Symmetry: C4
Subunit: 109 residues, 4 copies
């Protein structure tokens, strides 16, 4: 199918393998692709990325986030209705109340 | 699916299938033994046989599924039986009732 | 297929597709440029488009096919044109006639 | 499908991933599986292995040898009718006159 996402940087564009994408974030009306070594902008929506990203690795976990389960370090029940994801590079990502069942069902816990 | 999510004391930990050494039924619970950690999972060994890659994982005992890629050596320890030396030093049994299936699948005989 | 066999002065060298950076048509001959070496191949660029993985390789010029996994960054160098900075430091063109196809496939635009 | 070959050693059996098999040799009425770190015996014939080994990596190159093209370092035309394969660990493997066309056709040179 496809195996790289092209992030927009200030001067050029950087092809990043899917394997190096940690998460994607909808923020300030754009999609930010957060890769291990850089961050950049993409024109596709999170809805479009859900179609194109491999469903074995990537999961919509919040209206504003797609996470790569291979960069998840730990999953915490931060409150009674949500999760908080500890990423391998120290970042955190929320699983919202509205995605929390889908998230845990798909991940099998 | 790509990872298995192990239950921990404060949370859950996604582990790739490549890092799972073996799974053990114990006390009405499945224990997934990965390189860095062990945790529980809600699926039975029979459910995991369905969902784990058949090229890599094999039920070898009523209480164990082993990842063949973490078997260091296979030794006959009885008339009707094998014993698996794992990479990390541990040892997993192949019971009498699985020894024939086990060797047919791994192709020694 | 898994490897491409490059012709050398004393012989031939199998290179995995992962190690091919780009292929270049020159003088009635295809040059496969791998990380450690360059050699010739009897297949045309058109033949190689058929046989190389579409997720990884793309014809970007009448004289080049590039491996997207060895592109370091993509820069616009003209109205109708891109220039590819490769990992090893080299630079490959995307000609006017391929620039649109190139960006549609890589998903920037 | 399958992803390990079980070699017979003096005391036990050792599962080896296909990726670590360099070549197989029919010799003295047995099959010897030559892996990066050890050698051992298998009950299947070279004919049977041709069926079971991935055709993208493994090739029958001689009535007595199956080679893994991923462990080939260089291919030499040692005479006008044969090739000689330089393996990555320093060993050599012949491509006989009778397999030489099939070998070069499959490898594309
Ligand atoms: Mg992880
Ligand atoms: Mg082993
Ligand atoms: Mg790159
Ligand atoms: Mg090699």
């Amino acid at each position: 199918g496809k195996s790289v996402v092209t992030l927009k940087t200030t001067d050029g564009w950087i092809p990043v393998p899917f394997s190096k994408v940690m998460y994607l974030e909808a923020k300030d009306k754009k999609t930010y692709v957060n890769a291990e070594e850089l961050t950049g902008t993409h024109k596709y929506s999170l809805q479009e990325f859900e179609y194109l990203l491999p469903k074995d690795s990537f999961i919509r976990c919040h209206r504003s986030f797609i996470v790569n389960v291979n960069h998840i370090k730990a999953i915490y029940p931060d409150t009674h209705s949500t999760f908080l994801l500890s990423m391998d590079n120290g970042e955190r990502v929320p699983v919202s109340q509205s995605y929390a069942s889908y998230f845990r069902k798909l991940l099998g816990f």
